[PDB]
Amino acid sequence: DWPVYHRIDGPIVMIGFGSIGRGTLPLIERHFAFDRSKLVVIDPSDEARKLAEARGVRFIQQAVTRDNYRELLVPLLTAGPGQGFCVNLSVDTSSLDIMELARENGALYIDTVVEPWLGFYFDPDLKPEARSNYALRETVLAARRNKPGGTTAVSCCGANPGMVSWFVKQALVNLAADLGVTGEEPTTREEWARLAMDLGVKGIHIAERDTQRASFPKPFDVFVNTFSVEGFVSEGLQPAELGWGTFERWMPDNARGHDSGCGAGIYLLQPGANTRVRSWTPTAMAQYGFLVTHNESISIADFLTVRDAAGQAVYRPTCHYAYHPCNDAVLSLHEMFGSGKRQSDWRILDETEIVDGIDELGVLLYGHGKNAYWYGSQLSIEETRRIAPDQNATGLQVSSAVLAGMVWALENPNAGIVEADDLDFRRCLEVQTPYLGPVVGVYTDWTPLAGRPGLFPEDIDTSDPWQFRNVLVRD
Amino acid sequence: DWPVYHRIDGPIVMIGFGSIGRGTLPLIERHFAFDRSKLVVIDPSDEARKLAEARGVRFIQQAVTRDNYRELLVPLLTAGPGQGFCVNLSVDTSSLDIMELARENGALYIDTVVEPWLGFYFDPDLKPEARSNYALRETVLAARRNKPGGTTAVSCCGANPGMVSWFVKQALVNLAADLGVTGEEPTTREEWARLAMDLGVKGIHIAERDTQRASFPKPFDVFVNTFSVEGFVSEGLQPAELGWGTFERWMPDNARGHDSGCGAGIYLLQPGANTRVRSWTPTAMAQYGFLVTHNESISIADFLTVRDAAGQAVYRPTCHYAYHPCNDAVLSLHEMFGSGKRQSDWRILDETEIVDGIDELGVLLYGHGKNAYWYGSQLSIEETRRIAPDQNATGLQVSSAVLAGMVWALENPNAGIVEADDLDFRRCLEVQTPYLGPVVGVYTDWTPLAGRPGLFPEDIDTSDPWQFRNVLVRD
Ligand SMILES: NC(=O)c1ccc[n+]([C@@H]2O[C@H](COP(=O)([O-])OP(=O)(O)OC[C@H]3O[C@@H](n4cnc5c(N)ncnc54)[C@H](O)[C@@H]3O)[C@@H](O)[C@H]2O)c1
Ligand SMILES: NC(=O)c1ccc[n+]([C@@H]2O[C@H](COP(=O)([O-])OP(=O)(O)OC[C@H]3O[C@@H](n4cnc5c(N)ncnc54)[C@H](O)[C@@H]3O)[C@@H](O)[C@H]2O)c1
């Protein structure tokens, strides 16, 4: 008795059939009506081909490249009779170029990252700033300015970026209610931004702890993760990056801003997966997270910016990832950065290989009158296995978020290029929540200055515990 | 047919019966002749009591403290008929005070660390310099000056500090042959220092990689290690510390020296178990180690110091620990520092819980004509079980070193206060080698600049790859 949300009146082209594609395909088949032969999967991998053949879906074993993407995707997306849907869950392909092609041809589009064409991330002719997610996001914002309106294309609608934007909205509404502030839920961007300002939210961590454990010990010289290894390593080697709040009064010497764009970002001249921050989640309590760059770090800070009449920002929250991956990924990062190079092999943990654990993923709003508030999902691998096949808990949070964005795009098909912060957060969470396990809000009195200073001198700001000065792990 | 080296006619007083005591006692019973009833074990824990009772050995369930150690230990050391042997394998006791008591009463003494009385490691009034192993070692050096000669007391004779001092001497001999350096084998401290200078040894890593894996996944909120958790955490929270070589051109801003003493060391105003360094071992290849303070970092650099007539140091190698512990300890450190406090529970892995792996422990001599040379032990858990009971591979490298130090002290019982660098390294390795598994020398062309600079600017010294400026990892 699963709900069927909408009929798709055209081709469904899934680009990429890795961990997320494999988890999303069953949800698409479950929740949408369409003729079976309308759906086709594109992935160059032989392992992906064999899995698709076993599931009985059409499969085209090809890499989408800058050279072929028009000749390949335009016929597939315009096969008729009506509007198709491009579901982009790949690596090494330009989200912007495919998004623009889909829009030119009237097809809906969704992805989970602003990915560039193969060769971008390690091109030595690029300055660190050009490798930032801020710069990639600005290409999408410029595309929206150049062609406002038109067919809906949802950028960066996964678990994070994606779902966490909806959690921020629900958390802000919950904070206001827990303070006795009633009525008038925000409906415009400026109203959301002023709610965060008015409640005194200084910053937001994307506070995640993955406790999924494997049935085999970590193999030497193998990178192990619960989702894309190539994707995670690629983003881990990008500069550490954060949305930068107006309350901050210190940044590292190797921090830099941007000459252009929305104004909400800084980056550090060091890899994010080797940069630690002090953070907190309900199950982990105090923990280190890695400051891996993510689209929502910028987009959430941008969304919640209040400007004056002159257009200058007067309020903006800090926002960044504080990611504690599964234990085998922690070991994998230690191995990779300690050897100076990528391991010779890698593997993504299948649900059949996971003995227990959860993916605790939420937002940590701090600086307000109740200090810190964590809101998000505590989905376990055991619950995952009972409600959705072919994925672990990490994957289900992502694939259910793509499902939600697809429902929203089908229900709002003339909205133009949108981010997760632009969607109806209540409708999206209504679609996604059956796949999120426990969704809870927890207050804590912890701050980054708990237990500090210790036995060594430290550079801290005791008048403001949540300053980045105190969060960043430094010598 | 294990060799029985000597008969011990006096009391054998073992202070502490933890992981090392439990591995050393069977070796003492195997390799020395004596009546079992002259053994006495002192330990405050019930777990130790039951283990000692299971071996039918006399047990005293007491913590040795500053308030009771004289009245508790003097009768035991002087019970006769022969000369006593105090084997100190404890935590929370003063190595110096117990050592001086033993010498005062004509009893031999051996320990594996310069330990202070309980309370020192976390006294909030102590300046960081006073919490350094340099300072603790200076208390032993002063005792030797104040009372030269006399009954032999062996300070810091475990695997590291201890065995690695003998590896350094053998490695210097191997390097001299391979580099064509001619001359008689050195037989005095000055001649060893001169050999290291003449070979161009810029520095030495105590380069260790523990690959022992457990049969169960790491539990949350449990520190897991292959030896003393309390001792490892205590030394991990002391300042990072190293012997400081004359070739070094740079030290970090938070580095500090010493106004008095042998002059061979610096320390950093940060905990050593959260300080990473770039290093290398044969099985690990390039890896991160932690810069945990160790007595041998100072003692080896001091031993290999060449002075001019004025008394000023003209050559000294850098020397420090570069320790990659077992995977569960790596996770335990990330957990402990990430939370800001010790875990609620801890456990030491038993040989029955270890499924495979080795304790690769050696010395990496670098800066010479063949770049870098690693010499040491690759003892596996499988070999350990075949040759010695009640311990893992980490433990056996330590207990066999205590055995070797005991044999040397019996054959040299009036040598005064001595460090491992002062013992006859060939005789000690003759006793220890049956318990070390493969002992190999390996050259490598790896340097700390391999693959650098990369995607980001780095504060490196391209003129000399082995500078500490290139080894230390900045966060
Ligand atoms: N927003 C989020 O929450 C979130 C979470 C996880 C992953 N992601 C992103 O989703 C994407 C997929 O993650 P994943 O775990 O499935 O990764 P994955 O590595 O498992 O799978 C990637 C797939 O892309 C395919 N591929 C490679 N080059 C291709 C090309 N040129 N054309 C088509 N396909 C190609 C590969 O064969 C592979 O099957 C990644 O880009 C990742 O960054 C987003
Ligand atoms: N040099 C080396 O290679 C090396 C290697 C490992 C350990 N060590 C050192 O050896 C020592 C023993 O290590 P371990 O692994 O056996 O430690 P452990 O923690 O396993 O055991 C310590 C024992 O000391 C006992 N103890 C505590 N307080 C005491 C007191 N006041 N008097 C007497 N006993 C007391 C405890 O009850 C326990 O049984 C530690 O100090 C450690 O730092 C040296």
PDB file of N, CA and C in Angstrom, chain A residues 121-122 128 131 209 213 217-220 237-239 268-271 274 276 283-288 290 324 327 330-331 334-335 337-339 455-457 473-475, chain B residues 121-122 128 131 209 213 217-220 237-239 254 268-271 274 276 283-284 286-288 290 324 327 330-331 334 337-339 455-457 473-475:
ATOM      1  N   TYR A 121      38.482  18.461 -11.455  1.00  0.00           N
ATOM      2  CA  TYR A 121      38.888  18.548 -10.053  1.00  0.00           C
ATOM      3  C   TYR A 121      40.406  18.544  -9.872  1.00  0.00           C
ATOM      4  N   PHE A 122      41.151  17.893 -10.770  1.00  0.00           N
ATOM      5  CA  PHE A 122      42.596  17.761 -10.623  1.00  0.00           C
ATOM      6  C   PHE A 122      43.373  18.484 -11.717  1.00  0.00           C
ATOM      7  N   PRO A 128      42.837  27.146  -6.283  1.00  0.00           N
ATOM      8  CA  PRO A 128      41.921  26.522  -5.316  1.00  0.00           C
ATOM      9  C   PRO A 128      40.529  27.136  -5.335  1.00  0.00           C
ATOM     10  N   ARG A 131      38.231  25.601  -7.714  1.00  0.00           N
ATOM     11  CA  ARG A 131      37.831  24.249  -7.358  1.00  0.00           C
ATOM     12  C   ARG A 131      36.764  24.227  -6.275  1.00  0.00           C
ATOM     13  N   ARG A 209      26.920  11.705  11.908  1.00  0.00           N
ATOM     14  CA  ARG A 209      27.740  10.607  12.407  1.00  0.00           C
ATOM     15  C   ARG A 209      27.200   9.318  11.807  1.00  0.00           C
ATOM     16  N   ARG A 213      28.915  -0.345  10.525  1.00  0.00           N
ATOM     17  CA  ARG A 213      30.117  -1.157  10.668  1.00  0.00           C
ATOM     18  C   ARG A 213      30.030  -2.375   9.763  1.00  0.00           C
ATOM     19  N   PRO A 217      37.019  -6.703   8.684  1.00  0.00           N
ATOM     20  CA  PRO A 217      37.871  -5.580   9.086  1.00  0.00           C
ATOM     21  C   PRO A 217      38.412  -4.833   7.876  1.00  0.00           C
ATOM     22  N   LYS A 218      38.813  -3.586   8.104  1.00  0.00           N
ATOM     23  CA  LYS A 218      39.238  -2.759   6.987  1.00  0.00           C
ATOM     24  C   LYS A 218      40.450  -3.393   6.308  1.00  0.00           C
ATOM     25  N   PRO A 219      40.394  -3.660   5.009  1.00  0.00           N
ATOM     26  CA  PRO A 219      41.575  -4.199   4.326  1.00  0.00           C
ATOM     27  C   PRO A 219      42.622  -3.122   4.111  1.00  0.00           C
ATOM     28  N   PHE A 220      43.883  -3.504   4.295  1.00  0.00           N
ATOM     29  CA  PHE A 220      44.987  -2.608   4.001  1.00  0.00           C
ATOM     30  C   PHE A 220      44.931  -2.162   2.544  1.00  0.00           C
ATOM     31  N   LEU A 237      39.142  16.366  -1.190  1.00  0.00           N
ATOM     32  CA  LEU A 237      40.354  17.028  -1.649  1.00  0.00           C
ATOM     33  C   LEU A 237      40.099  18.442  -2.145  1.00  0.00           C
ATOM     34  N   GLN A 238      38.838  18.826  -2.327  1.00  0.00           N
ATOM     35  CA  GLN A 238      38.491  20.221  -2.547  1.00  0.00           C
ATOM     36  C   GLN A 238      38.799  21.040  -1.294  1.00  0.00           C
ATOM     37  N   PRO A 239      38.970  22.349  -1.440  1.00  0.00           N
ATOM     38  CA  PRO A 239      39.213  23.188  -0.264  1.00  0.00           C
ATOM     39  C   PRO A 239      38.101  23.051   0.764  1.00  0.00           C
ATOM     40  N   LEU A 268      39.205  27.569   2.803  1.00  0.00           N
ATOM     41  CA  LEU A 268      40.538  27.469   3.376  1.00  0.00           C
ATOM     42  C   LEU A 268      41.460  26.764   2.389  1.00  0.00           C
ATOM     43  N   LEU A 269      42.719  27.189   2.371  1.00  0.00           N
ATOM     44  CA  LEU A 269      43.701  26.632   1.443  1.00  0.00           C
ATOM     45  C   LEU A 269      44.258  25.311   1.980  1.00  0.00           C
ATOM     46  N   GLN A 270      43.346  24.368   2.214  1.00  0.00           N
ATOM     47  CA  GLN A 270      43.709  23.033   2.683  1.00  0.00           C
ATOM     48  C   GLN A 270      42.557  22.082   2.388  1.00  0.00           C
ATOM     49  N   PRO A 271      42.825  20.788   2.221  1.00  0.00           N
ATOM     50  CA  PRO A 271      41.740  19.856   1.891  1.00  0.00           C
ATOM     51  C   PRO A 271      40.770  19.657   3.048  1.00  0.00           C
ATOM     52  N   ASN A 274      40.869  16.608   5.453  1.00  0.00           N
ATOM     53  CA  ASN A 274      41.947  16.621   6.433  1.00  0.00           C
ATOM     54  C   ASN A 274      41.870  17.854   7.330  1.00  0.00           C
ATOM     55  N   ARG A 276      39.690  19.294  10.649  1.00  0.00           N
ATOM     56  CA  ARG A 276      38.761  18.857  11.683  1.00  0.00           C
ATOM     57  C   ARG A 276      38.090  20.044  12.377  1.00  0.00           C
ATOM     58  N   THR A 283      23.815  10.896  19.141  1.00  0.00           N
ATOM     59  CA  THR A 283      24.383   9.585  19.421  1.00  0.00           C
ATOM     60  C   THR A 283      25.876   9.667  19.688  1.00  0.00           C
ATOM     61  N   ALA A 284      26.579  10.557  19.000  1.00  0.00           N
ATOM     62  CA  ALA A 284      28.014  10.669  19.206  1.00  0.00           C
ATOM     63  C   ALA A 284      28.373  11.534  20.403  1.00  0.00           C
ATOM     64  N   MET A 285      27.492  12.436  20.822  1.00  0.00           N
ATOM     65  CA  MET A 285      27.881  13.476  21.781  1.00  0.00           C
ATOM     66  C   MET A 285      28.973  14.302  21.083  1.00  0.00           C
ATOM     67  N   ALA A 286      29.896  14.876  21.846  1.00  0.00           N
ATOM     68  CA  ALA A 286      30.991  15.633  21.257  1.00  0.00           C
ATOM     69  C   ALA A 286      31.859  14.725  20.395  1.00  0.00           C
ATOM     70  N   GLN A 287      32.261  15.236  19.236  1.00  0.00           N
ATOM     71  CA  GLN A 287      33.036  14.469  18.266  1.00  0.00           C
ATOM     72  C   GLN A 287      33.783  15.429  17.355  1.00  0.00           C
ATOM     73  N   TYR A 288      34.807  14.902  16.690  1.00  0.00           N
ATOM     74  CA  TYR A 288      35.374  15.581  15.540  1.00  0.00           C
ATOM     75  C   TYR A 288      34.507  15.315  14.320  1.00  0.00           C
ATOM     76  N   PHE A 290      34.823  16.259   9.961  1.00  0.00           N
ATOM     77  CA  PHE A 290      35.637  16.814   8.897  1.00  0.00           C
ATOM     78  C   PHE A 290      34.879  17.925   8.187  1.00  0.00           C
ATOM     79  N   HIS A 324      31.358  13.135  10.569  1.00  0.00           N
ATOM     80  CA  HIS A 324      32.070  11.974  11.108  1.00  0.00           C
ATOM     81  C   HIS A 324      31.628  10.743  10.329  1.00  0.00           C
ATOM     82  N   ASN A 327      33.512   4.241  10.657  1.00  0.00           N
ATOM     83  CA  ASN A 327      34.852   3.982  11.189  1.00  0.00           C
ATOM     84  C   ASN A 327      35.833   3.578  10.086  1.00  0.00           C
ATOM     85  N   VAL A 330      36.924   6.693   8.326  1.00  0.00           N
ATOM     86  CA  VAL A 330      37.908   7.403   9.136  1.00  0.00           C
ATOM     87  C   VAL A 330      39.289   6.786   8.923  1.00  0.00           C
ATOM     88  N   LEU A 331      39.387   5.462   9.066  1.00  0.00           N
ATOM     89  CA  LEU A 331      40.657   4.790   8.815  1.00  0.00           C
ATOM     90  C   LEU A 331      41.127   5.011   7.381  1.00  0.00           C
ATOM     91  N   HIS A 334      42.708   8.469   7.104  1.00  0.00           N
ATOM     92  CA  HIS A 334      44.007   8.462   7.760  1.00  0.00           C
ATOM     93  C   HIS A 334      45.050   7.799   6.866  1.00  0.00           C
ATOM     94  N   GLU A 335      44.668   6.696   6.212  1.00  0.00           N
ATOM     95  CA  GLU A 335      45.563   5.972   5.320  1.00  0.00           C
ATOM     96  C   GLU A 335      45.886   6.793   4.087  1.00  0.00           C
ATOM     97  N   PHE A 337      45.602  10.159   3.452  1.00  0.00           N
ATOM     98  CA  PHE A 337      46.369  11.382   3.663  1.00  0.00           C
ATOM     99  C   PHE A 337      47.754  11.086   4.216  1.00  0.00           C
ATOM    100  N   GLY A 338      47.906   9.978   4.940  1.00  0.00           N
ATOM    101  CA  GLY A 338      49.207   9.619   5.472  1.00  0.00           C
ATOM    102  C   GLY A 338      50.143   9.027   4.435  1.00  0.00           C
ATOM    103  N   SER A 339      49.597   8.420   3.375  1.00  0.00           N
ATOM    104  CA  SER A 339      50.430   7.933   2.287  1.00  0.00           C
ATOM    105  C   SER A 339      50.611   8.966   1.186  1.00  0.00           C
ATOM    106  N   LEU A 455      45.468  21.515  29.416  1.00  0.00           N
ATOM    107  CA  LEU A 455      46.789  21.707  30.000  1.00  0.00           C
ATOM    108  C   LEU A 455      47.741  22.485  29.103  1.00  0.00           C
ATOM    109  N   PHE A 456      47.345  22.814  27.883  1.00  0.00           N
ATOM    110  CA  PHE A 456      48.189  23.595  26.995  1.00  0.00           C
ATOM    111  C   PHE A 456      47.536  24.938  26.690  1.00  0.00           C
ATOM    112  N   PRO A 457      48.329  25.989  26.484  1.00  0.00           N
ATOM    113  CA  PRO A 457      47.751  27.258  26.031  1.00  0.00           C
ATOM    114  C   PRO A 457      46.981  27.068  24.733  1.00  0.00           C
ATOM    115  N   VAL A 473      39.794  22.859  14.601  1.00  0.00           N
ATOM    116  CA  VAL A 473      40.872  22.153  15.278  1.00  0.00           C
ATOM    117  C   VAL A 473      42.195  22.683  14.735  1.00  0.00           C
ATOM    118  N   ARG A 474      42.973  23.313  15.609  1.00  0.00           N
ATOM    119  CA  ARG A 474      44.229  23.972  15.282  1.00  0.00           C
ATOM    120  C   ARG A 474      45.346  23.417  16.161  1.00  0.00           C
ATOM    121  N   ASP A 475      46.585  23.741  15.797  1.00  0.00           N
ATOM    122  CA  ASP A 475      47.760  23.245  16.521  1.00  0.00           C
ATOM    123  C   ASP A 475      47.697  23.589  18.015  1.00  0.00           C
TER     124      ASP A 475
ATOM    125  N   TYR B 121      50.857  13.529  36.107  1.00  0.00           N
ATOM    126  CA  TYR B 121      50.507  13.701  34.702  1.00  0.00           C
ATOM    127  C   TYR B 121      49.393  14.720  34.486  1.00  0.00           C
ATOM    128  N   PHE B 122      48.584  15.014  35.510  1.00  0.00           N
ATOM    129  CA  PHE B 122      47.456  15.927  35.356  1.00  0.00           C
ATOM    130  C   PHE B 122      47.430  16.999  36.442  1.00  0.00           C
ATOM    131  N   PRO B 128      54.091  23.209  31.256  1.00  0.00           N
ATOM    132  CA  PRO B 128      54.282  22.134  30.265  1.00  0.00           C
ATOM    133  C   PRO B 128      55.687  21.546  30.271  1.00  0.00           C
ATOM    134  N   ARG B 131      56.086  18.768  32.578  1.00  0.00           N
ATOM    135  CA  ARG B 131      55.381  17.541  32.232  1.00  0.00           C
ATOM    136  C   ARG B 131      56.093  16.758  31.140  1.00  0.00           C
ATOM    137  N   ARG B 209      54.497   0.436  13.170  1.00  0.00           N
ATOM    138  CA  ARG B 209      53.164   0.206  12.630  1.00  0.00           C
ATOM    139  C   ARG B 209      52.636  -1.079  13.251  1.00  0.00           C
ATOM    140  N   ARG B 213      44.697  -6.846  14.473  1.00  0.00           N
ATOM    141  CA  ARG B 213      43.263  -6.627  14.335  1.00  0.00           C
ATOM    142  C   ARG B 213      42.512  -7.541  15.289  1.00  0.00           C
ATOM    143  N   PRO B 217      34.395  -5.686  16.317  1.00  0.00           N
ATOM    144  CA  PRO B 217      34.538  -4.275  15.932  1.00  0.00           C
ATOM    145  C   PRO B 217      34.719  -3.391  17.153  1.00  0.00           C
ATOM    146  N   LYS B 218      35.332  -2.237  16.929  1.00  0.00           N
ATOM    147  CA  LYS B 218      35.632  -1.344  18.041  1.00  0.00           C
ATOM    148  C   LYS B 218      34.336  -0.891  18.699  1.00  0.00           C
ATOM    149  N   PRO B 219      34.166  -1.084  20.009  1.00  0.00           N
ATOM    150  CA  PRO B 219      32.947  -0.599  20.666  1.00  0.00           C
ATOM    151  C   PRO B 219      32.978   0.905  20.848  1.00  0.00           C
ATOM    152  N   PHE B 220      31.798   1.512  20.765  1.00  0.00           N
ATOM    153  CA  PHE B 220      31.669   2.934  21.037  1.00  0.00           C
ATOM    154  C   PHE B 220      31.986   3.223  22.503  1.00  0.00           C
ATOM    155  N   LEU B 237      48.977  12.502  26.233  1.00  0.00           N
ATOM    156  CA  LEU B 237      48.563  13.842  26.625  1.00  0.00           C
ATOM    157  C   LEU B 237      49.719  14.694  27.128  1.00  0.00           C
ATOM    158  N   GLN B 238      50.910  14.117  27.266  1.00  0.00           N
ATOM    159  CA  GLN B 238      52.092  14.924  27.503  1.00  0.00           C
ATOM    160  C   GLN B 238      52.421  15.705  26.234  1.00  0.00           C
ATOM    161  N   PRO B 239      53.189  16.783  26.356  1.00  0.00           N
ATOM    162  CA  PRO B 239      53.618  17.514  25.159  1.00  0.00           C
ATOM    163  C   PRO B 239      54.268  16.573  24.160  1.00  0.00           C
ATOM    164  N   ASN B 254      55.095  27.097  18.368  1.00  0.00           N
ATOM    165  CA  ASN B 254      54.751  26.593  19.689  1.00  0.00           C
ATOM    166  C   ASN B 254      55.762  25.582  20.201  1.00  0.00           C
ATOM    167  N   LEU B 268      56.650  20.521  22.134  1.00  0.00           N
ATOM    168  CA  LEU B 268      55.635  21.363  21.512  1.00  0.00           C
ATOM    169  C   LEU B 268      54.475  21.517  22.476  1.00  0.00           C
ATOM    170  N   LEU B 269      53.859  22.692  22.467  1.00  0.00           N
ATOM    171  CA  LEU B 269      52.762  22.985  23.384  1.00  0.00           C
ATOM    172  C   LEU B 269      51.443  22.432  22.833  1.00  0.00           C
ATOM    173  N   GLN B 270      51.444  21.120  22.607  1.00  0.00           N
ATOM    174  CA  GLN B 270      50.262  20.389  22.161  1.00  0.00           C
ATOM    175  C   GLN B 270      50.461  18.920  22.499  1.00  0.00           C
ATOM    176  N   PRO B 271      49.381  18.155  22.657  1.00  0.00           N
ATOM    177  CA  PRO B 271      49.536  16.745  23.028  1.00  0.00           C
ATOM    178  C   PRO B 271      50.082  15.900  21.886  1.00  0.00           C
ATOM    179  N   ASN B 274      47.890  13.764  19.516  1.00  0.00           N
ATOM    180  CA  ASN B 274      47.134  14.481  18.503  1.00  0.00           C
ATOM    181  C   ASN B 274      48.073  15.292  17.614  1.00  0.00           C
ATOM    182  N   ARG B 276      50.576  14.740  14.341  1.00  0.00           N
ATOM    183  CA  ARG B 276      50.964  13.775  13.320  1.00  0.00           C
ATOM    184  C   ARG B 276      52.270  14.171  12.645  1.00  0.00           C
ATOM    185  N   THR B 283      56.181  -2.417   5.985  1.00  0.00           N
ATOM    186  CA  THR B 283      54.848  -2.928   5.707  1.00  0.00           C
ATOM    187  C   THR B 283      53.842  -1.817   5.436  1.00  0.00           C
ATOM    188  N   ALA B 284      54.003  -0.660   6.062  1.00  0.00           N
ATOM    189  CA  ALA B 284      53.062   0.430   5.869  1.00  0.00           C
ATOM    190  C   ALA B 284      53.383   1.311   4.677  1.00  0.00           C
ATOM    191  N   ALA B 286      54.566   4.758   3.157  1.00  0.00           N
ATOM    192  CA  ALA B 286      54.330   6.067   3.751  1.00  0.00           C
ATOM    193  C   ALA B 286      53.075   6.043   4.622  1.00  0.00           C
ATOM    194  N   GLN B 287      53.177   6.615   5.827  1.00  0.00           N
ATOM    195  CA  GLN B 287      52.066   6.646   6.769  1.00  0.00           C
ATOM    196  C   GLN B 287      52.196   7.871   7.654  1.00  0.00           C
ATOM    197  N   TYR B 288      51.093   8.215   8.326  1.00  0.00           N
ATOM    198  CA  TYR B 288      51.149   9.127   9.456  1.00  0.00           C
ATOM    199  C   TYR B 288      51.566   8.347  10.699  1.00  0.00           C
ATOM    200  N   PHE B 290      51.980   9.277  15.052  1.00  0.00           N
ATOM    201  CA  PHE B 290      51.742  10.259  16.098  1.00  0.00           C
ATOM    202  C   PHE B 290      53.050  10.537  16.819  1.00  0.00           C
ATOM    203  N   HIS B 324      52.249   4.622  14.376  1.00  0.00           N
ATOM    204  CA  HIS B 324      50.924   4.294  13.868  1.00  0.00           C
ATOM    205  C   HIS B 324      50.404   3.111  14.671  1.00  0.00           C
ATOM    206  N   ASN B 327      44.562  -0.260  14.379  1.00  0.00           N
ATOM    207  CA  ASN B 327      43.437   0.505  13.853  1.00  0.00           C
ATOM    208  C   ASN B 327      42.472   0.894  14.960  1.00  0.00           C
ATOM    209  N   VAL B 330      43.799   3.866  16.696  1.00  0.00           N
ATOM    210  CA  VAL B 330      43.636   5.066  15.876  1.00  0.00           C
ATOM    211  C   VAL B 330      42.221   5.610  16.031  1.00  0.00           C
ATOM    212  N   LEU B 331      41.232   4.722  15.963  1.00  0.00           N
ATOM    213  CA  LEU B 331      39.847   5.120  16.186  1.00  0.00           C
ATOM    214  C   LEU B 331      39.638   5.612  17.611  1.00  0.00           C
ATOM    215  N   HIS B 334      40.925   9.232  17.851  1.00  0.00           N
ATOM    216  CA  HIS B 334      39.996  10.141  17.187  1.00  0.00           C
ATOM    217  C   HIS B 334      38.789  10.379  18.074  1.00  0.00           C
ATOM    218  N   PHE B 337      40.102  12.480  21.558  1.00  0.00           N
ATOM    219  CA  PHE B 337      40.333  13.902  21.337  1.00  0.00           C
ATOM    220  C   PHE B 337      39.102  14.593  20.772  1.00  0.00           C
ATOM    221  N   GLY B 338      38.309  13.895  19.964  1.00  0.00           N
ATOM    222  CA  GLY B 338      37.097  14.497  19.433  1.00  0.00           C
ATOM    223  C   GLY B 338      36.077  14.812  20.505  1.00  0.00           C
ATOM    224  N   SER B 339      36.033  14.012  21.565  1.00  0.00           N
ATOM    225  CA  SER B 339      35.099  14.264  22.649  1.00  0.00           C
ATOM    226  C   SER B 339      35.684  15.160  23.723  1.00  0.00           C
ATOM    227  N   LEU B 455      48.022  20.023  -4.368  1.00  0.00           N
ATOM    228  CA  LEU B 455      46.973  20.933  -4.820  1.00  0.00           C
ATOM    229  C   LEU B 455      46.959  22.263  -4.075  1.00  0.00           C
ATOM    230  N   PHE B 456      47.567  22.339  -2.894  1.00  0.00           N
ATOM    231  CA  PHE B 456      47.528  23.539  -2.076  1.00  0.00           C
ATOM    232  C   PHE B 456      48.939  24.002  -1.739  1.00  0.00           C
ATOM    233  N   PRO B 457      49.120  25.288  -1.459  1.00  0.00           N
ATOM    234  CA  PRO B 457      50.434  25.754  -1.003  1.00  0.00           C
ATOM    235  C   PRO B 457      50.789  25.137   0.340  1.00  0.00           C
ATOM    236  N   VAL B 473      52.991  17.484  10.442  1.00  0.00           N
ATOM    237  CA  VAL B 473      51.712  17.761   9.800  1.00  0.00           C
ATOM    238  C   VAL B 473      51.044  18.919  10.528  1.00  0.00           C
ATOM    239  N   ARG B 474      50.695  19.963   9.787  1.00  0.00           N
ATOM    240  CA  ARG B 474      49.984  21.098  10.360  1.00  0.00           C
ATOM    241  C   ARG B 474      48.478  20.919  10.202  1.00  0.00           C
ATOM    242  N   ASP B 475      47.739  21.248  11.258  1.00  0.00           N
ATOM    243  CA  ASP B 475      46.278  21.220  11.209  1.00  0.00           C
ATOM    244  C   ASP B 475      45.710  22.626  11.413  1.00  0.00           C
TER     245      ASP B 475
END
